[PDB]
Amino acid sequence: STFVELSTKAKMPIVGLGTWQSPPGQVKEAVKVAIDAGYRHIDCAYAYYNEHEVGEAIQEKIKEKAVRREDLFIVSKLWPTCFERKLLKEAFQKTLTDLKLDYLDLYLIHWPQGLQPGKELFPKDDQGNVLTSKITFLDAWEVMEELVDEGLVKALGVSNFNHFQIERILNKPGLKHKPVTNQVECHPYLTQEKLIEYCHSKGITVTAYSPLGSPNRPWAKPEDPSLLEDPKIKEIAAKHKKTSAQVLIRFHIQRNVVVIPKSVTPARIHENFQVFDFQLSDQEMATILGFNRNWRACLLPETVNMEEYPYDAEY
Numbered sequence: 001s002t003f004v005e006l007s008t009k010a011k012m013p014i015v016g017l018g019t020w021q022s023p024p025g026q027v028k029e030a031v032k033v034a035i036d037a038g039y040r041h042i043d044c045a046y047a048y049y050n051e052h053e054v055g056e057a058i059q060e061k062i063k064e065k066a067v068r069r070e071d072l073f074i075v076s077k078l079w080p081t082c083f084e085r086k087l088l089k090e091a092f093q094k095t096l097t098d099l100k101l102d103y104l105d106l107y108l109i110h111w112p113q114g115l116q117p118g119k120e121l122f123p124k125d126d127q128g129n130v131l132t133s134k135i136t137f138l139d140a141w142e143v144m145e146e147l148v149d150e151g152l153v154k155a156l157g158v159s160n161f162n163h164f165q166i167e168r169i170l171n172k173p174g175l176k177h178k179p180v181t182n183q184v185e186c187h188p189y190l191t192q193e194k195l196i197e198y199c200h201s202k203g204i205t206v207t208a209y210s211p212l213g214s215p216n217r218p219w220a221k222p223e224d225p226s227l228l229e230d231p232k233i234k235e236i237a238a239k240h241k242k243t244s245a246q247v248l249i250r251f252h253i254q255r256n257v258v259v260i261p262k263s264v265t266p267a268r269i270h271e272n273f274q275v276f277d278f279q280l281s282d283q284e285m286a287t288i289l290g291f292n293r294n295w296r297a298c299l300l301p302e303t304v305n306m307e308e309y310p311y312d313a314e315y
């Protein structure tokens with residue numbers, strides 16, 4: 001399938017363009033190329049400081065008439081430093097202004113742990129400890145649901161949430177809108193079988209980021225596992241006349257998981273989208289699933305303490 005059905009009955013293109021770390025002076029071209037190559041799902045975030053450029057690219061493609069707003073599925077995320085009623089709506093409106101849109105198809109809590117306000121993604125004290133906040137994601141969720149009922153957000157979702165944190169929201173008194181997706185790191189070394197199974201059992205889809213093991217992430221020792229270099233994956237790729245990256249991307253699609261590979265390289269953007277004309281066999285999917293080691297490439301040590309740290313739980 002080329003899309004996933006959300007609980008709201010809306011369609012989410014199973015493949016989208018990731019933009020984390022995409023330099024501001026390159027993401028605009030990346031989005032234009034992505035749209036020209038066929039992408040209709042763009043994943044954005046306030047914390048990426050590049051939404052203004054994404055918005056310029058979109059506006060231009062709509063202006064050209066190659067696409068209409070309705071053809072695109074735009075995703076953005078609320079940063080934990082803005083859980084507060086006021087700061088939340090300001091961050092949302094700012095995201096809407098930067099992207100030059102009137103509504104978002106999906107708005108996600110970028111991280112469960114509320115953080116101290118300010119122009120800092122991770123405010124730290126004198127020692128360097130990240131200052132958390134009392135405001136919870138349920139507090140933010142209530143106001144985010146307002147955006148939904150006012151038609152400014154088509155659906156809400158979460159990112160980097162373990163199943164407990166999702167349970168907290170599904171069973172919240174007076175729940176108005178259920179999350180439609182949990183965006184988490186997922187690839188062969190971190191298959192997320194339990195979390196995916198838990199989400200699907202609740203009618204919640206899963207969006208996989210860092211599908212290529214994110215071999216870019218700043219500070220990543222040389223002898224760290226490389227999914228793009230693994231001979232077994234390369235072998236499977238070659239038999240299908242595809243690249244490893246295309247296999248790592250196709251992997252999620254066959255598990256009915258949305259995947260958002262990131263790139264600012266026109267050629268790779270093009271490459272990551274040629275994943276709808278082939279099928280991995282049952283044995284190949286098993287071989288790939290067998291790579292799991294619950295190894296996280298993301299992981300930010302400075303967050304291991306936070307009460308809402310989501311990676312200690314089983315799933």
Ligand SMILES: NC(=O)c1ccc[n+]([C@@H]2O[C@H](COP(=O)([O-])OP(=O)(O)OC[C@H]3O[C@@H](n4cnc5c(N)ncnc54)[C@H](OP(=O)(O)O)[C@@H]3O)[C@@H](O)[C@H]2O)c1
Nearest residue numbers: 018019020209210211212213214216245261262263264265
């Ligand atoms: N919610 C969160 O906490 C969170 C965290 C991280 C990321 N994300 C989202 O997930 C998206 C995934 O990006 P990511 O950095 O995490 O990891 P990724 O997509 O697995 O890997 C991105 C890296 O792979 C390179 N690349 C892309 N296509 C390639 C190909 N076909 N062959 C070889 N190399 C290729 C990119 O290089 P070039 O750009 O140089 O081509 C970049 O250095 C992000 O853009 C973002 O939207 C969300």
